[PDB]
Amino acid sequence: GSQDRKIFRGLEICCYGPFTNMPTDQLEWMVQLCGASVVKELSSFTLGTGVHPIVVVQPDAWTEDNGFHAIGQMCEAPVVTREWVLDSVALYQCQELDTYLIPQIPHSHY
């Protein structure tokens, strides 16, 4: 570019859920500051030219009642805890989503 760069450069990340009491408006801002774009919903994603779709979650305030075992099935993008957004905005670099994406593994406590 000229006077910009952004670590995301054409990106779309949506924060689903209340998380806690900050990772909502401040989260979309951070991503936006990194080059991404705040997506209202999952269906809001649009295949432009260099805009990649991404999703964010946080099994904290969501608690158990509706069901969080169907994120990727409901969204057509990679869901990653705010850790990604934070880890990326912290050091400034599009970190691997797989590091904060939906684990989904057999068993739970062993």
Curated annotation (Swiss-Prot):
Changing residue 51 to D: In BC; benign; functionally neutral in vitro. Isoform 1 and isoform 3 are widely expressed. Isoform 3 is reduced or absent in several breast and ovarian cancer cell lines. Changing residue 22 to K: In BC; pathogenic; strongly reduced transcription transactivation; abolishes interaction with BRIP1 and RBBP8. Changing residue 36 to T: In BC; uncertain significance; functionally impaired in vitro. Changing residue 17 to V: In BC; pathogenic; functionally impaired in vitro. It comes from the Eukaryota. Residues 3-102 form the BRCT domain. Disulfide bonds: none annotated. It is found in: Nucleus; Chromosome; Cytoplasm. Phosphorylated in response to IR, UV, and various stimuli that cause checkpoint activation, probably by ATM or ATR. Phosphorylation by AURKA regulates centrosomal microtubule nucleation. Changing residue 13 to S: In BC; pathogenic. The BRCT domains recognize and bind phosphorylated pSXXF motif on proteins. The interaction with the phosphorylated pSXXF motif of ABRAXAS1, recruits BRCA1 at DNA damage sites. The RING-type zinc finger domain interacts with BAP1. Heterodimer with BARD1. Part of the BRCA1-associated genome surveillance complex (BASC), which contains BRCA1, MSH2, MSH6, MLH1, ATM, BLM, PMS2 and the MRE11-RAD50-NBN protein (MRN) complex. This association could be a dynamic process changing throughout the cell cycle and within subnuclear domains. Component of the BRCA1-A complex, at least composed of BRCA1, BARD1, UIMC1/RAP80, ABRAXAS1, BRCC3/BRCC36, BABAM2 and BABAM1/NBA1. Interacts (via the BRCT domains) with ABRAXAS1 (phosphorylated form); this is important for recruitment to sites of DNA damage. E3 ubiquitin-protein ligase that specifically mediates the formation of 'Lys-6'-linked polyubiquitin chains and plays a central role in DNA repair by facilitating cellular responses to DNA damage. It is unclear whether it also mediates the formation of other types of polyubiquitin chains. The BRCA1-BARD1 heterodimer coordinates a diverse range of cellular pathways such as DNA damage repair, ubiquitination and transcriptional regulation to maintain genomic stability. Regulates centrosomal microtubule nucleation. It is linked to Breast cancer: A common malignancy originating from breast epithelial tissue. Breast neoplasms can be distinguished by their histologic pattern. Invasive ductal carcinoma is by far the most common type. Breast cancer is etiologically and genetically heterogeneous. Important genetic factors have been indicated by familial occurrence and bilateral involvement. Mutations at more than one locus can be involved in different families or even in the same case. Breast-ovarian cancer, familial, 1: A condition associated with familial predisposition to cancer of the breast and ovaries. Characteristic features in affected families are an early age of onset of breast cancer (often before age 50), increased chance of bilateral cancers (cancer that develop in both breasts, or both ovaries, independently), frequent occurrence of breast cancer among men, increased incidence of tumors of other specific organs, such as the prostate. This is Breast cancer type 1 susceptibility protein. It comes from Homo sapiens (Human). The gene is BRCA1. The chain holds residues 1755 to 1863 of 1863 of the full protein.
